[PDB]
Design an enzyme around this catalytic site. Structure first.
Site, short mmCIF file in Angstrom:
data_model
loop_
_atom_site.label_atom_id
_atom_site.label_comp_id
_atom_site.label_asym_id
_atom_site.label_seq_id
_atom_site.Cartn_x
_atom_site.Cartn_y
_atom_site.Cartn_z
CB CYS A 119 -3.13 9.90 -8.37
SG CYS A 119 -4.10 8.79 -7.31
CB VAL A 136 -5.58 11.57 -13.86
CG1 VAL A 136 -6.46 10.78 -15.02
CG2 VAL A 136 -4.69 10.24 -13.36
S1 CLF Z 1 -8.71 9.63 -2.42
FE1 CLF Z 1 -3.54 6.81 -3.44
S2 CLF Z 1 -2.83 7.98 -1.65
FE2 CLF Z 1 -3.76 9.51 -3.05
S3 CLF Z 1 -2.02 10.34 -4.13
FE3 CLF Z 1 -3.26 8.40 -5.40
S4 CLF Z 1 -1.74 6.64 -4.86
FE4 CLF Z 1 -1.17 8.27 -3.28
FE5 CLF Z 1 -8.64 7.28 -1.85
S5 CLF Z 1 -8.59 6.15 -3.56
FE6 CLF Z 1 -6.33 6.38 -2.83
S6 CLF Z 1 -6.66 7.26 -0.91
FE7 CLF Z 1 -6.37 9.05 -2.19
S7 CLF Z 1 -5.21 8.21 -4.25
FE8 CLF Z 1 -7.73 8.08 -4.20
#
Ligand code: CLF
Ligand code: CLF
Ligand code: CA
Ligand code: CA
Ligand code: MG
Ligand code: MG
Ligand code: H2S
Ligand code: H2S
Lengths: 522, 477, 522, 477
Positions: free
Chosen positions: C152, C156
């Site tokens: 994501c 973005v």
């Molecule tokens: S580094 Fe989250 S798993 Fe991702 S594509 Fe976004 S919803 Fe799916 Fe860490 S904080 Fe989270 S786990 Fe990744 S997105 Fe970022």
């Protein structure tokens, strides 16, 4: 009373207060029942080592046996031949029972006739019953073969099957060329598996003993397979699939998998599939004969060695990893076919599952029972999984078989706490699961009463049943499962580890009590 | 189907048989005429089975151990002989009971002498005496033992009566020898009679000199209800709501004491005539207890039975009868309102043992269903006399039907539903014909009484109207 | 304390009195815990209709979702291609979670890389990360294809995958001809199944968009099969087995059954099996394309219809009897192959099992959840079994799907008491199973917490979980099962009826209380 | 082999990489020299991962939500952003607790704002405020809310601090904004630090001038034990048998009140240095509370730690220390007597996160095992300084190991056991190398303390010596 939108069957209808009050009044008024404190005291005693010692001193009483009688096995063997009617010379009550017992395990029709001997036959014997019975069965049910066994009244009166069948043909009741193989199957000898061996050897003799002059060992390039008394459809199927994958020519001798699994398509098929008469006639031309369940095929073995001159290999039932490996290596040697990539990969997928599940299996303790070959293969696989098979019960086992299992246990550290019991029944086993409580039982549906008894002592003492064996009457479609080969071992492993994990989930489901260990991931 | 078409179907089916079998089977197949009161003019029954034709019948040991004795809950029943018979009959019949199994009650256990060759060659009497001592040690709360003979016992000349008398005297215990060897008679039926005479000879007279029972004018026994799925309990509740006192149940949920108290009752209520008429006639003879047949299948029969039973007592019981009928009226009317429109006009063929083939017809008719064929494994001509007025004109009757006959009759008649046993079930389902077990109730029930009618109706509907039946024909065939 | 010959893990160690007393002192001394009477009062309130109405008014808060994010699906799609490395452009945390999530369900390795974009990439974008990441991945893991999706933060920031991959090739980081299909997979759109659809359509476009002018529909005599997001090995296997038995030429497009089931034979295989690049290049030459899970393959469908000019048939998922029949009749129509005797017999064996088991299934009430196609097929099969699917939850469902399921329900008398929920989660479902209690739940491992909650209200309120779906983390090897075709229907029927009978045995196990109905035979 | 063979194994493995990756990875791989006390002379750590190389690392959200905040049992932790991160991290980490889940405790639940495209485009701060009101309605016994930012939150410019301030004031509620977006830092490590600072800024000062709590001289806190499989409870029991009072556990089975009471303790006991050194140094700076590192893995380390802790108190605690050591001596001695002969000489390679890769070495050595290779996902050079004295001469060290490297190192070194995580487990089992999960304890544990050592030994034995390992080669190959 009933509420029409939510009708109650016996459970839970009889828990309604009016029923409960009525049953209290019945008890108090008319049953002269032992006081509940006395019932509780006796129950507690039946769980003790003192009781177990009296229980194991029995010589005359059997309680909750884990075996059946010869002709049941003769019937199952006969059902494995093309258009064959199982026919039991003797008393009709027996056939109602044999059919019902298999009906309930397979949820299928089970075709079998009697010749309805009555008290009158004690004077003169059952010759006329054999004459009219063979004629009537051939005309009405149009089998291509009638395979004859006996009930105990026919054995005690001493009816000579061979003479009676020969006289039926002599006197024109059935054609001279119509096949009527036979076996004496006394219920007071051995068990149902002995009936299977007796029937099979009779059928084999019928088609081969007098035609040996033109036979040449190996000339048809096939291997004969004799399954023995087998009540999992997947066990006939896995053997055929593995031999076909390996490009091995084979004949499965007694193959009921079609007639025990006909489709529901708007017609009833009395007969389906089965070993052909041509396959039995040709069998001595095989390279060799493999017995899948040798500890109940001793008479067949003697015939195959003594008459067919096959050097039957010393193989254990193909259960677990080591004994499936050994079966495939010996089939490879006999046939000249390599073990194919497909079976090597299936083996490795079983080993993968073992590595994945070994932490939950390790050290788990089992009580188990069934027929001798099944039992010894389940013991072997449990040792392969790092499990402890601590109570091994084989009611129909013998001293030679026990010595063999004791040697298997002695060779594994996982056998240190195990004992093999022969001639003992499920009332004996009930004592063992109280006095030396295992984690689980692996057995047939009769084990549910032992689980019930153990819960009554308390939840902490409950020994859950895992249903593997025969008969299984209280679950649906488990007869479709497999216990042989890598496929069988994968199914067994999966059933055992998920039984462990379901019980652990039960024990950890208590909110703010035990659910600190109610893990999402295991 | 016309009378002439049913007669033609019987002759067509009989063409398969050799001449001796054809001539015999012809006598056991009839087209109902409800005016006949002498069924010995139109059907033969209670004869030997023809060899090789796949009778559905069992044996005398089934009739004695499986049916009459086995349900008695606080006795230990020994299957005496080789291991088969006790194992196949272990917990197959749903004769329900309240007890602590293995401690004070023993119904679903299999006790056996497991005959081996030495027992056949030299006799089982020493083994039986030792077995009795082992039972007494390991099951001390048993209140009596029965010895259920299997085929070899009479054939080898054992004397189980002597062992029973000697051991019973030694232990101050009721020990009942039963000569129900499967070579006796032709079916389960003679097992009933043997069993009834064993109750008479060894149990029923125990309290003949005893005056300590507190009797009432309203004391009855339920005779011939084996409490399949709780059937006797859903009967008992209505008799006791009507003001009666049910002293005994023979033998579903039965105790030895309630059997011993039965001679003290005012009236024997006979449901299963076939299996228990023998001891009912004995009790009238010896104790002066009247008996009467009744029927608790469906609301019409249950209401008629409650009124007929109440008429044997005083105005207080007749008033309570009408209060029971008024209580349950809205309950069974709701069952009929829901299920009758789902079943009206559907046609049923039945094949069962000795009672149910006639006794359940009323309950089918209370759901608008028609019984177009019926028959019995082991009924006698007095049962057929009762059947001919319960069945419609020109319907098919079959005694000791062969597997072949039952399949061919079904193929021609094309019933909507079949009610029979476990050996029949899977045949008919493969043919696309809804099937209900009318022995075991297909692990459902009770079916007796008003509470049982609701479950019966639910069950006939769930099976007859199930979505599976439209799916047997693949759409590409 | 421990006793060395019976070591206790957390359960039951912490039930020892010293640990219980210690935990009581911790609570009372330091936790300022709500009184137990208040905890009980609030628990009871969370079971009520009043609470359910507030729960269903949520607009902003999600609790215990029953969906995951797009790139998880892109990864699973990518795994199904021969020697293909899934590659997720963006943040590395995401990849550790995707791999772990699948590791726990399959109990297998799951290979996937990141290009480890950090906060620095917010200025300048992730172009350099793509260049070095492709080069490094190709050199180190020697894939034949890298299939690129996004996290994501990449979405973005707005990274143009097409331009970044093109520049990686132009500047020499990877050879021009090295296949790098891609898809934008924003986690804030749709769910994991949307990620699968996006990845698949990107791979299909990569191998076919620019090469259409030589394609001829029907010229390779095969049918393309697109399975969608699929986590039962038996589902890929059953489709291939049925088409092989019919003699139908096919190409299964995304086939991870080999790489998710490698043998434990002493070597690690990063890649195994999978759809070939040639299969994708040649796919426009098929007779047609069948979508096994159409409700998450809408973008795939538009590309296959729009570009390959295939007339994709309107087929439901092949689950249950009617929809398996429809699947096979349509495959027969397209291929010109008749439905073979083997599949006709298997169909009738399923119908036999339905006849055998219908009395225990009838009227049984279920709550269930999962992905849209799986849910609608389970609903359909439950109606065929005479069961009532009363709470149907699909968190990632849409209005058009709901209308379709509502129409299936309206056509059966077994649908009368059923409601379909979209956009609702497992905290919504928890309320429904309290307020309108069903007999069982059919769901994934997150259902275990609902079962726990229901038991806490009382044994009579407990709703047992039957584990069918994804993820299943708390049982072993259920990923080997099947839910499609007649084989899957047989497996689902067997699991459902034996769950019913297991629970009835628990409820009737009570000595002298409920065991009047503890039948040997069911 | 020796330093020679290990250096050339490093060089051979690095031959696969493009130049930039090769040059970087060479700096993260070292051959131990236990005399080095400045690891910045032999290994680089806490740097970005190289693109495309299959790092085992997670992100800052994992370090904040997954590790530090998520275990706090009576707070609700919002995974704020799209649905993935909260779902993959739901109940994956076995941070055990006592509570009534969904009612007063919330650890294994997944609360999320499930961002959609309109939230990315227009911002999530309105959704967050509404979500807080919905939490307060449906979870009234929650004792505080945390907001665990996922990647999009800072990227789109949302102001969760303003929402937390406004809603906290409106509702008189502790609402903690945590800027643990996974774009921040290089690994789980920065999420620890971010998380520590959010405790400091929004929770730890709440009771600064509140002297209601009754302190004793023996008050301690367990800092950095997340109670995996109950590890903190099997540690707490020993500290309290020694006469100490454990006011708080950070954060396994942790309550918000025990965290707020921690500034009243006399001594902070740090187990996980990496994750909690930050707040320990803060508490020494602000409150004057000393802290010390300890190790509860295996009897040798647990005995040394108990004695070192007791030495900070008085003779009464030192006496109770020796009573605890005497009590458990026969228990751990029995574990060694049974298991060490079964494991003596066996060689282990480890790869874990920030503490365990050095901390478990003593427990292996208590069973006669040798740790021949170790490494960390996300450790800093102060961790490597502590590792070089725990590891033997000429052992292999790996920082942020690649999948390729770990596989290649294992193929050459041929350890008897590997201890690592879920993404590693199934790879090594297929290679025929026994594997134990050293994060989740393979669904076992506890491993801390005397009681934990028994389970650790049982577990290493059951796996290393399992019969499955002899079966990977088919006998025909
Ligand atoms: S580094 Fe989250 S798993 Fe991702 S594509 Fe976004 S919803 Fe799916 Fe860490 S904080 Fe989270 S786990 Fe990744 S997105 Fe970022
Ligand atoms: S009519 Fe018994 S099943 Fe038979 S062969 Fe003997 S052991 Fe076996 Fe009736 S009493 Fe019994 S059931 Fe038959 S034998 Fe006779
Ligand atoms: Ca069937
Ligand atoms: Ca695996
Ligand atoms: Mg366990
Ligand atoms: Mg304990
Ligand atoms: S029993
Ligand atoms: S939960």
């Amino acid at each position: 009373s009933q509420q029409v939108d939510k009708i109650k069957a016996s459970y839970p209808l009889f828990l309604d207060q009016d029923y409960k009050d009525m049953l209290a009044k019945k008890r108090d008024g008319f049953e002269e029942k032992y006081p509940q404190d006395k019932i509780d005291e006796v129950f507690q005693w039946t769980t003790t080592k003192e009781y177990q010692e009296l229980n194991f001193q029995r010589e005359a009483l059997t309680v909750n046996p884990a075996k059946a009688c010869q002709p049941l096995g003769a019937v199952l063997c006969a059902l494995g031949f093309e258009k064959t009617m199982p026919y039991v010379h003797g008393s009709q009550g027996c056939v109602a029972y044999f059919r019902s017992y298999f009906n309930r395990h397979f949820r299928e029709p089970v075709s079998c006739v009697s010749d309805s001997m009555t008290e009158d036959a004690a004077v003169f014997g059952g010759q006329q019953n054999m004459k009219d019975g063979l004629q009537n069965c051939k005309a009405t049910y149009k089998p291509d073969m009638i395979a004859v066994s006996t009930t105990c009244m026919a054995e005690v009166i001493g009816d000579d099957l061979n003479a009676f069948i020969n006289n039926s043909k002599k006197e024109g009741f059935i054609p001279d060329e119509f096949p009527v193989p036979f076996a004496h199957t006394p219920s007071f000898v051995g068990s149902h598996v002995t009936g299977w061996d007796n029937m099979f050897e009779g059928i084999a003799r019928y088609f081969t003993l007098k035609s040996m002059d033109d036979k040449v060992v190996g000339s048809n390039k096939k291997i004969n397979i004799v399954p023995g008394f087998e009540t999992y459809l997947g066990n006939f199927r896995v053997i055929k699939r593995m031999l076909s994958e390996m490009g091995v020519g084979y004949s499965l001798l007694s193959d009921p998998e079609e007639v025990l699994d006909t489709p529901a398509d708007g017609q009833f098929r009395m007969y389906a599939g089965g070993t052909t008469q041509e396959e039995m006639k040709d069998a001595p031309n095989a390279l060799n004969t493999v017995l899948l369940q040798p500890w109940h095929l001793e008479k067949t073995k003697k015939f195959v060695e003594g008459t067919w001159k096959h050097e039957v290999p010393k193989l254990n039932i193909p259960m677990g990893l080591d004994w499936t490996d050994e079966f495939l290596m010996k089939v490879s040697e006999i046939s000249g076919q390599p073990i194919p990539a497909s079976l090597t990969k299936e083996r490795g997928r079983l080993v993968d599952m073992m590595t994945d599940s070994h932490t939950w299996l390790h050290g788990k303790r089992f009580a188990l029972w069934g027929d001798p070959d099944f039992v010894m293969g389940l013991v072997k696989f449990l040792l392969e999984l790092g499990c402890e098979p601590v109570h091994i019960l084989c009611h129909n086992g013998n001293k030679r078989w026990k010595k063999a299992v004791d040697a298997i246990l002695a060779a594994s550290p996982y056998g240190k706490n195990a004992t093999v019991y022969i001639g003992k029944d499920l009332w004996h086993l009930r004592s063992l699961v109280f006095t030396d409580k295992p984690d689980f039982m692996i057995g047939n549906s009769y084990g549910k009463f032992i689980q019930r008894d153990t819960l009554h002592k308390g939840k902490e003492f409950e020994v859950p049943l895992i249903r593997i064996g025969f008969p299984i009457f209280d679950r649906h479609h488990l007869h479709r499962s497999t216990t042989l080969g890598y496929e069988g071992a994968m199914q067994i492993l999966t059933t055992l580890v998920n039984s462990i994990l379901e019980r652990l989930d039960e024990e950890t489901r208590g909110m703010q009590a035990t659910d600190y260990n109610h893990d999402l991931v295991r | 189907m016309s009378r002439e078409e049913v007669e033609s179907l019987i002759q067509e089916v009989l063409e398969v048989y050799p001449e001796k079998a054809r001539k015999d089977r012809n006598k056991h197949l009839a087209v109902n005429d409800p005016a006949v009161t002498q069924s010995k003019k139109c059907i033969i029954s209670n004869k030997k089975s023809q060899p090789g034709l796949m009778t559905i019948r069992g044996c005398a040991y089934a009739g004695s151990k499986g049916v009459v004795w086995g349900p008695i809950k606080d006795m230990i029943h020994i299957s005496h002989g080789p291991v088969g018979c006790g194992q196949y009959s272990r917990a197959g019949r749903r004769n329900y009971y309240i007890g602590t199994t293995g401690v004070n009650a023993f119904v679903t256990m299999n006790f056996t002498s497991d005959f081996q060759e030495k027992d056949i060659v030299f006799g089982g009497d020493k083994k039986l005496a030792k077995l009795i001592d082992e039972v007494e040690t390991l099951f001390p709360l048993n209140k009596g033992i029965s010895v259920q003979s299997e085929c070899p016992i009479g054939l080898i000349g054992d004397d189980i009566e002597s062992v029973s008398k000697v051991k019973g005297a030694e232990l101050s215990k009721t020990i009942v020898p039963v000569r129900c060897e499967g070579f006796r008679g032709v079916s389960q039926s003679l097992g009933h009679h043997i069993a009834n005479d064993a109750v008479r000879d060894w149990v029923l007279g125990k309290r003949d000199e005893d005056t300590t029972f507190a009797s009432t004018p309203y004391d009855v026994a339920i005779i011939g209800d084996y409490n399949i799925g709780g059937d006797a309990w859903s009967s008992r509740i209505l008799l006791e709501e009507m003001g009666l006192r049910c002293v005994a149940q023979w033998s579903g949920d039965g105790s030895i004491s309630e059997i011993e108290l039965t001679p003290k009752v005012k009236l024997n209520l006979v449901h299963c005539y076939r299996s228990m008429n023998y001891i009912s006639r004995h009790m009238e003879e010896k104790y002066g207890i009247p008996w009467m047949e009744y029927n608790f299948f469906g609301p019409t029969k249950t209401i008629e039975s409650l009124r007929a039973i109440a008429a044997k007592f005083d105005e207080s019981i007749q008033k309570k009868c009408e209060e029971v009928i008024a209580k349950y009226k809205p309950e069974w009317e709701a069952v009929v309102a829901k299920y009758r429109p789902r079943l009206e006009g559907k046609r049923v063929m039945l094949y069962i043992g000795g009672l149910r083939p006639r006794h359940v017809i009323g309950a089918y008719e209370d759901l608008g269903m028609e019984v177009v064929g019926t028959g019995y494994e082991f009924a006698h001509n007095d049962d057929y006399d009762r059947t001919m007025k319960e069945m419609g004109d020109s319907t098919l009757l079959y005694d000791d039907v062969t597997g072949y006959e039952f399949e061919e009759f079904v193929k021609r008649i094309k019933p909507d539903l079949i009610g029979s046993g476990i050996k029949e079930k899977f045949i008919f389902q493969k043919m696309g014909i809804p099937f209900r077990e009318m022995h075991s109730w297909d692990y459902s029930g009770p079916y007796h009484g008003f509470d049982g009618f609701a479950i019966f109706a639910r069950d006939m509907d769930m099976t007859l109207n199930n979505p599976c039946w439209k799916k047997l024909q693949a759409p590409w065939e």
